[PDB]
Amino acid sequence: SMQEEDTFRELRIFLRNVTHRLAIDKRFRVFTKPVDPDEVPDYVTVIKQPMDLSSVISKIDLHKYLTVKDYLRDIDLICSNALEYNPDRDPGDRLIRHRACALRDTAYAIIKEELDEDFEQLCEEIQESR
Numbered sequence: 001s002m003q004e005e006d007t008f009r010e011l012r013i014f015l016r017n018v019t020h021r022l023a024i025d026k027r028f029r030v031f032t033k034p035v036d037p038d039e040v041p042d043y044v045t046v047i048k049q050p051m052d053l054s055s056v057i058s059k060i061d062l063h064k065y066l067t068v069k070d071y072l073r074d075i076d077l078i079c080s081n082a083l084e085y086n087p088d089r090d091p092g093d094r095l096i097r098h099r100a101c102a103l104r105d106t107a108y109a110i111i112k113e114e115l116d117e118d119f120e121q122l123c124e125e126i127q128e129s130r
């Protein structure tokens with residue numbers, strides 16, 4: 001229905017706004033673009049599901065997210081990819097892990113404050129109905 005398409009449009013507007021707020025944060029600059037194989041050719045071999053905020057914006061616009069839970073699965077991948085690829089005790093790896101966890105925690109905190117639970121439940125019920 002048009003009412004359902006309106007619902008998903010509102011979801012996309014909400015997700016673009018959350019994703020913009022993460023992308024303009026200076027801590028999260030490393031997560032705004034895909035890893036360049038040039039610098040990191042072993043990346044694509046270790047990390048099977050690369051994810052970054054530019055890929056998230058592309059997916060919103062392709063209507064790949066029908067619920068905030070599907071979006072958060074991709075935010076969680078940005079974090080878990082960084083924890084897996086950069087596990088060492090040296091400061092460069094610890095800084096990327098801290099920034100990755102901070103990205104994830106910031107996205108969850110914005111959604112806890114600003115997502116209406118009944119809106120998410122409506123999205124889930126339309127998605128399950130398809």
Ligand SMILES: CC[C@H](C)[C@H](NC(C)=O)C(=O)NCC#CBr
Pocket residue numbers: 029030035036040043081082085086092096
């Ligand atoms: C691509 C692997 C790399 C070792 C790591 N990045 C990620 C996303 O894991 C990192 O240390 N980034 C440095 C910079 C910049 Br912009």
Ligand SMILES: [Cl-]
Pocket residue numbers: none
């Ligand atoms: Cl830096």
